[PDB]
Design an enzyme around this catalytic site. Structure first.
Site, PDB file in Angstrom:
ATOM      1  N   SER A  27      11.473  29.271 -20.465  1.00 20.23           N
ATOM      2  CA  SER A  27      10.564  30.572 -20.887  1.00 20.23           C
ATOM      3  C   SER A  27      11.213  32.090 -20.863  1.00 20.23           C
ATOM      4  O   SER A  27      11.175  32.497 -22.141  1.00 20.23           O
ATOM      5  CB  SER A  27       9.431  30.506 -19.804  1.00 20.23           C
ATOM      6  N   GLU A  49      -0.346  33.439 -21.735  1.00 20.41           N
ATOM      7  CA  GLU A  49       0.428  34.388 -20.909  1.00 20.41           C
ATOM      8  C   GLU A  49      -0.264  34.944 -19.731  1.00 20.41           C
ATOM      9  O   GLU A  49      -1.342  35.225 -19.631  1.00 20.41           O
ATOM     10  CB  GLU A  49       0.737  35.795 -21.807  1.00 20.41           C
TER      11      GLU A  49
END
Lengths: 125, 125, 125, 125
Positions: A27, A49
DNA sequence: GGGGATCCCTAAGCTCCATCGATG
DNA sequence: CATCGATGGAGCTTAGGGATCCCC
DNA sequence: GGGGATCCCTAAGCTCCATCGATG
DNA sequence: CATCGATGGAGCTTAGGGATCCCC
């Protein structure tokens, strides 16, 4: 970098709300657009998020959000920001709900309230 | 190591319009979670990644359970991607798997049948 | 990706000409500016981009060169391109010697000849 | 693994104005070559990177030879960077090393003396 | 079969451990 | 008495070129 | 001593090997 | 008879949070 513990925490919540969910690897230092978590219950798909703050406001870099929506669009999911304040519950915010600063975005005292519960997220469509 | 095949396969997905991601921490206790998840607004994939030195690849009926349980819950199609020492990646739906008992498998009988990535995206139409 | 074998080859030449030389790791997928080789003999320091061609011309991306000079400037060395044509010897070209295409650089039949031997590189200053 | 300390140290160098690089393939036969080489137009470094669980770190007089042989030939200063389990990186010139016989070392006597990166750049003036 | 794209096997490293010595 | 399957382990570093295997 | 920044130790995986079975 | 040094090996995966160690 405590962010991890909260990612793991939220995953349980999602899984409890019926969402097959996962954390995105590579990520950070990534070769492509990558959010923190991805989930689907068969009816809904979520690009997410994750953010934890002691207190509002929460600011989100212009870039960061571009990347989330860029990804959300591609994958076929709904871009979301999950916010965690200490005493309160996980709040879910669609990128439509975000407010623009000069060169970024934010969720402050005027926006946090109109955020969603995990249960609202699943059964809205 | 075999991490250059790992990320090699991602590229393929991306190449094919797919927005794929590596599941964080899936060398984990038998947890309903693929090694990769991808999607392109239309087709969504749940992919168990196997790199075997040779045929057959055996797959505990348990291991399979998880892929299907997850796939179902997420709203994706269950697949086993498999690379062999000089052959390129090759995609197998759970259906296409051959059975035994405590396991399923993939040997000479089915291997040439296994799909290629693009043909996988092509199914939807 | 045969480039490696020629990097290793050149290193011997350098080492034979009195240059403590090395290959740069993480060169490709890198967190920073990184050439192929770096060398110093105590009097001269070289940032080098290595290239092997069957035949001229050799084109060098605008970016690539920016990165080499950016690095060369920072480190305190002289930016160089080492070119290898099959039958001929290693030729050394200072970035000053490069010719601009539309959106890039090149070394062709008109430039290759005025390139340097490894021995000229060491004792010019 | 210890690769997050490896690249952790690079950052430090860069931070300090240094243009540093990791030597390609220096887990190689005792070849005159540091694990890192850095420079900033003025000061050039040849850095043997050691990560020890505790003091002392012993260093075969051979291992040292190579660092000095190289350092000399390249035109740089010889250093041993050393990180301990809860202490941050710490730089030692070859001079600062304590001797025995077939080896040198670094224990409590010298460790607090070891320099820090910035102080290393500061020597030049 | 010959020619080429793909491996894997070989030599090496380091860090930590544990034997073993010698010296005090 | 061998082959396909299954069961319970142990090893888990890099990196280059010579050697392999495939395919035409 | 109490409070905080840094580890390391624990549980797990997979791939390959090799025992062991059963069936033909 | 232990400690500092040296010598010859073997292990080399990830990843998270509870536990440690440091420092004030």
């Amino acid at each position: 970098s405590k962010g991890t513990r909260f990612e793991r925490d939220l995953l349980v919540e999602l899984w409890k709300a019926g969402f097959a969910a996962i954390r995105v690897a590579g990520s950070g230092v990534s070769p492509f657009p990558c959010p923190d978590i991805v989930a689907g219950n068969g009816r809904t798909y979520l690009a997410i998020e994750v953010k934890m703050r002691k207190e509002l406001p929460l600011y989100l870099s212009a870039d960061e959000v571009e990347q989330l929506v860029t990804f959300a669009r591609g994958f076929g999911a709904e871009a979301y920001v999950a916010l965690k304040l200490p005493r309160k519950k996980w709040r879910f915010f669609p990128v439509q709900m975000l407010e623009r600063t000069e060169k970024n975005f934010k969720i402050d005292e005027s926006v946090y309230p109109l955020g969603l519960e995990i249960a609202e997220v699943a059964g809205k469509f």
